[PDB]
């Protein structure tokens, strides 16, 4: 067989120029898209101010519009999903991830408009949904739309343009190219069989988008936290511990998110009106929280800096944790077109910080700064739930710029999966596919 | 589908026995990586108390400056030709092939050979890295265990071999991320799904990184401080630089390759024609390591100086070419050493230079040569060894200028974009193909 290999080595890295050039168009498009979404989402959460503030006098009138607004949109979100693209509603990564293995379709002519405008509602309303999944999914479809419009053939051009469309997407959402790539090739890619996905092609896509994101998000990190202190070796084990905690909590949160999405399936049974209504329900609910305790509602991003800083008290952290842990499930699990990727960061950050404050007062001789742990865990809930350690660790770094904490960030997110494994649970993204994949059949 | 649905639900379940072993591997790789690193130095030290001793008599200096290197250099080649020919050279092509079950892991042989072997080539002053040397000394460590504990299976052979590699790369550049990203971008069998457990590699890499930390703390390998940033109007400049690395990519590959042939003659295959031609290039290097060190040695030490803009345009090109030579002559001469690190030094120096030009070319971009010195420190790896991702991430991991990521990728990408469109191939895969085809027949 060495006969073939010797001929394969000498044939390495020869990606069709036509392919490459298209990963460029993809990444570019994904980017512009990624931005528009991001921008549009905000623009709405804005209106949702000029609404409150206009009625800031009659308190009951606030809490009213603080509900209505979210609700109305949230509903509009769900509606555009249940009636035009059920494949959308929810993360969106399980789908694209499955579509990679040729197990689910890329109804881009449907998904794009839905997921996009659909999320503007859910997110623009104030729900506990990220923007990651939403774009990663909006991404692949972009890469697929091109694949079709230029009818590029040969699996390579279908698994590659679908993959770059993903990373292009992920990167243009956290402004993190490395993470965008490392993600596809650690999670998204068909997990059990060699594939025709050209890396060099993905990069170009990711880059193109990262630029697009740089053209409009110029001059403003998403999560500025400044250079935190360092981490001696004698304080290393503390990060293992934190990981182990994330590890046992990892699968559990997965059970919830999962079951929770079942226990919520009843309420509507499958009825569009029982959904759309239960939609604006959790929606309006969120918008309310986004004026009476924002740390429990919305994206969560904004509180990551505050948390790391040590601005939240032990009391307020635990409140924020649980509160979110709930709004998160209730929002994601309710099949709303949104993600659970970003919000997971928020949880890890908050949970880490908390761990820190305890660590600090426990060992004043380690001269700790709870902020490190807030960062050693910002991606650990990703290393236990979605079990994508590498993509996390590198996504964190890519946006917390504290490389001096890489040795600790790994020692946590590793310990994360080490216990997320040894205690049941599975890739929260893979399980969702397995189910939707199984539910596909097992019903005929 | 039914299968998949059952596979998904079966993801990430690496045998506890396996994992626990990647830990011992990484640990060992680490201590090893250190001892190697430490020993090499220790020797380059002696060569000081040696010169200083004969610092009075100049010719006497230049003499011992040759002898010492030569003597060791030979001792290196010797311990390779006569005990493990599989060593001599990078060591990555081997392990890389051994991953596809196409070469053997004569660890009971390689370990002692490559190790003490490199202490000579390196400890003497040759233009050889320490990367490959350890990545290779690595897999063998993970193999030695595989054997001593007969953990059966392919997973335990492809995994303990892999983690031993990353553990190895990591403990060499103190860059865990790189160590891992490497295996899964280059080293891993390039054309068929495999039984290598990532979660296992990590644990390995980590354990070694710790090991490196336990003995290297408080001092980086390449300290460069926070460099300026990089507006988008100056991005294309980095593309250009990538395209340059992309054309020079394969070429340097040709040389490295051919040069190792044109060097095969001199000894024919004779152990004495080698060992002698060994301390020949060796003693040569150690001479240069006292009359123009930028041409000789590892090259690391001048990466900082280069980025700073301390070298003049003149001195850079001198240093480039000079190294471009000593590099080939040293690596291509089958000496037990690597071409990974020294490739960095070239990209750095080649980048800097590009910078100083860009600077005076566009004073309105308020450029700092130092940024290009970093957008290329791993671009020669993105054209020669065609392992962009591992490079980009290995640079970051040790230059710490994430602000430059958008540039670094736009160069290294353009690197492989031209290294491709203009012939060439993974200098590490070609060496395997060669050594693999020259095998059968």
């Amino acid at each position, epitope marked *: 067989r060495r006969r073939q290999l010797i001929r394969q080595l000498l044939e390495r890295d020869k990606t069709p120029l036509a392919i490459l050039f298209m990963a460029a168009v993809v990444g570019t498009l994904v980017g512009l898209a990624a931005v528009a979404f991001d921008k549009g989402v905000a623009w709405l959460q804005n209106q949702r101010m000029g609404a409150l503030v206009h009625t800031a006098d009659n308190y009951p009138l606030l809490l009213t519009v603080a509900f209505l607004c979210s609700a109305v949109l949230a509903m509009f979100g769900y509606f555009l999903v249940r009636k035009y693209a059920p494949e959308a509603g929810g993360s969106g990564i399980p789908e694209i991830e499955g579509a990679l293995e040729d197990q689910r379709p890329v109804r881009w002519w449907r998904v794009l408009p839905v997921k996009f405008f659909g999320g503007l509602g859910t997110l623009g309303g104030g729900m506990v949904l990220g923007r990651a999944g939403p774009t990663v999914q909006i991404g692949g479809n972009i890469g697929r739309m091109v694949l079709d419009i230029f009818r590029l053939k040969g699996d390579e051009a279908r698994h590659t343009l679908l993959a770059t469309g993903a990373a292009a997407g992920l990167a243009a959402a956290f402004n993190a190219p490395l993470a965008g790539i490392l993600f596809i090739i650690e999670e998204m890619r068909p997990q059990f069989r060699y594939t025709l996905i050209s890396i060099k092609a993905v990069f170009i896509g990711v880059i193109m988008s990262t630029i697009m994101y740089r053209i409009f998000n110029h001059e403003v990190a998403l999560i500025d936290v400044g250079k935190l202190s360092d981490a001696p070796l004698n304080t290393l084990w503390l990060y293992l511990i934190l990981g182990i905690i994330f590890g046992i909590f990892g699968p559990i949160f997965n059970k919830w998110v999962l079951g929770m999405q079942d226990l919520l399936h009843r309420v509507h049974g499958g009825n569009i009106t029982k959904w759309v209504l239960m939609g604006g329900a959790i929606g309006g609910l969120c918008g309310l929280l986004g004026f009476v305790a924002p740390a429990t509602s919305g994206g969560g991003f904004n509180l990551i800096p505050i948390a790391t800083a040590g601005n939240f008290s032990m009391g307020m952290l635990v409140f924020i944790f649980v509160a979110r842990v709930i709004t998160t499930l209730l929002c994601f699990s309710s099949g709303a077109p949104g993600g659970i990727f970003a919000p997971m960061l928020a949880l890890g950050t908050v949970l880490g910080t908390a761990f820190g404050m305890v660590a600090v007062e426990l060992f004043p001789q380690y001269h700790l700064e709870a902020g490190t742990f807030a960062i050693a865990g910002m991606g650990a809930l990703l290393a236990a739930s979605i079990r994508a350690p590498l993509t996390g660790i590198i996504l964190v770094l890519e946006m917390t710029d504290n490389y001096q904490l890489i040795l600790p960030m790994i020692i946590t997110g590793l310990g994360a999966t080490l216990l997320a494994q040894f205690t049941g649970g599975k890739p929260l993204y893979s399980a969702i596919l397995a189910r939707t994949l199984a539910k596909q059949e097992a019903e005929q | 589908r039914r299968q998949l649905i059952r596979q998904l639900l079966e993801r990430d379940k690496t045998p506890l026995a396996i994992l626990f072993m990647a830990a011992v591997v990484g640990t060992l790789v680490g201590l090893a990586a250190v001892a190697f690193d430490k020993g090499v130095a220790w020797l380059q030290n002696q060569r000081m108390g040696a010169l200083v001793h004969t610092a009075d008599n100049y010719p006497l200096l230049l003499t011992v400056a040759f002898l010492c290197s030569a003597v060791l250099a030979m001792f290196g080649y010797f311990l390779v030709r006569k005990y493990a020919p599989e060593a001599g050279g990078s060591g990555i092509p081997e392990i890389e092939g051994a991953l596809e079950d196409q070469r053997p892991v004569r660890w009971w042989r390689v370990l002692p050979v490559k190790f003490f072997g490199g202490l000579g080539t390196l400890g003497g002053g040759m233009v050889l890295g320490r990367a490959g040397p350890t990545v290779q000394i690595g897999g063998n460590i993970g193999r030695m265990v595989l054997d001593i504990f007969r953990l059966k299976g392919d997973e335990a052979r492809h995994t303990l071999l892999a983690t031993g590699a990353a553990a190895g790369l990591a403990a060499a550049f103190n860059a865990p991320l790189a160590g891992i990203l490497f295996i899964i971008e280059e080293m891993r069998p390039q054309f068929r799904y495999t039984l290598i457990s990532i979660k296992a590699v990590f644990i390995g890499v980590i354990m070694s990184t710790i090991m490196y930390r336990i003995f290297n703390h408080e001092v980086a390998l390449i300290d460069v401080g926070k460099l300026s940033d990089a507006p988008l109007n100056t991005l294309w400049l980095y593309l250009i630089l990538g395209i340059i690395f992309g054309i020079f990519g394969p070429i340097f590959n040709k040389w490295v390759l051919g040069m190792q042939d044109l060097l095969h003659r001199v000894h024919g295959g004779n152990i004495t024609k080698w060992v002698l031609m060994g301390g020949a290039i060796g003693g040569l290097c150690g001479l240069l390591g006292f009359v123009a060190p930028a041409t000789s040695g590892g090259g690391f030490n001048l990466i900082p100086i280069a980025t700073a803009g301390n070298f003049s345009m003149g001195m850079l090109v001198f240093i480039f070419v000079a190294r471009v030579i000593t590099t080939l002559l040293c690596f291509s001469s089958g000496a037990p050493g690597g071409i990974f690190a020294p490739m960095l030094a070239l990209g750095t120096v080649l980048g800097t230079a590009f910078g100083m030009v860009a600077v005076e070319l566009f004073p*309105q971009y308020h450029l700092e040569a130092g940024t290009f010195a970093i957008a290329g420190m791993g671009a020669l790896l993105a054209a020669s060894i065609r392992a962009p991702l591992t490079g980009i991430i290995l640079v970051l991991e040790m230059t710490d200028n994430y602000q430059l990521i958008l540039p670094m990728i736009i160069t290294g990408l353009g690197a492989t974009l031209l290294a491709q469109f203009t012939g060439g191939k993974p200098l590490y895969s070609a060496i395997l193909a060669r050594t693999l085809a020259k095998q059968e027949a």
Partner: antibody
Amino acid sequence: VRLLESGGGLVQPGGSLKLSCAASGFDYSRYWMSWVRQAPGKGLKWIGEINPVSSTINYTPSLKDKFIISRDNAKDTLYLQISKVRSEDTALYYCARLYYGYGYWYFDVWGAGTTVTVSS
Amino acid sequence: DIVLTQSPAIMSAAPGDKVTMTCSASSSVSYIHWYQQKSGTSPKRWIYDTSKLTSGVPVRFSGSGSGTSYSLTINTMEAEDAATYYCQQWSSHPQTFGGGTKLEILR
């Protein structure tokens, strides 16, 4: 974030004055400091610019050492020496902080001012 | 050294009026800037890269132009806009400022 430049004043033709500019409210490093002067009534005319590590310093089409910009990041202070001064040198001297958008640099945060009048 | 020359040297219009000042370059420039200067104060970075209002600039102000000739505009100007506006380029070294335009309010 404040830029307070002193030094200014009265100098006799053919003289030399060291205008200072103390920065505060931000990181002096990472920053390209410059000077621009406004002649009473007239507009602005860029004088010079000196990068962080001061390994770069370019002036306007000036002479040899008419101008001599420097900086002591150890005191987050920008300097400007003017030798053999003449009436054309009587204007308001601002020290700005430089930055950019897409990359075509601008004068970010201009300091106070300081005046120099050349006269006997 | 580009020769930026701001069209109206001095102009007056009544608040709520649409005012527009020009700034032509001798050669070619791109991503112009504009600084506002009110009596007694050092210049203030208004619009940049041809049309990016600076954090604070009333959305009243708009930037524009292209290579040879740019402009700054105020849709319905307000009396607090009385000042001197200076367009400046650095798409060619050394940088260069325009002659300025003094806005005066009619009341």
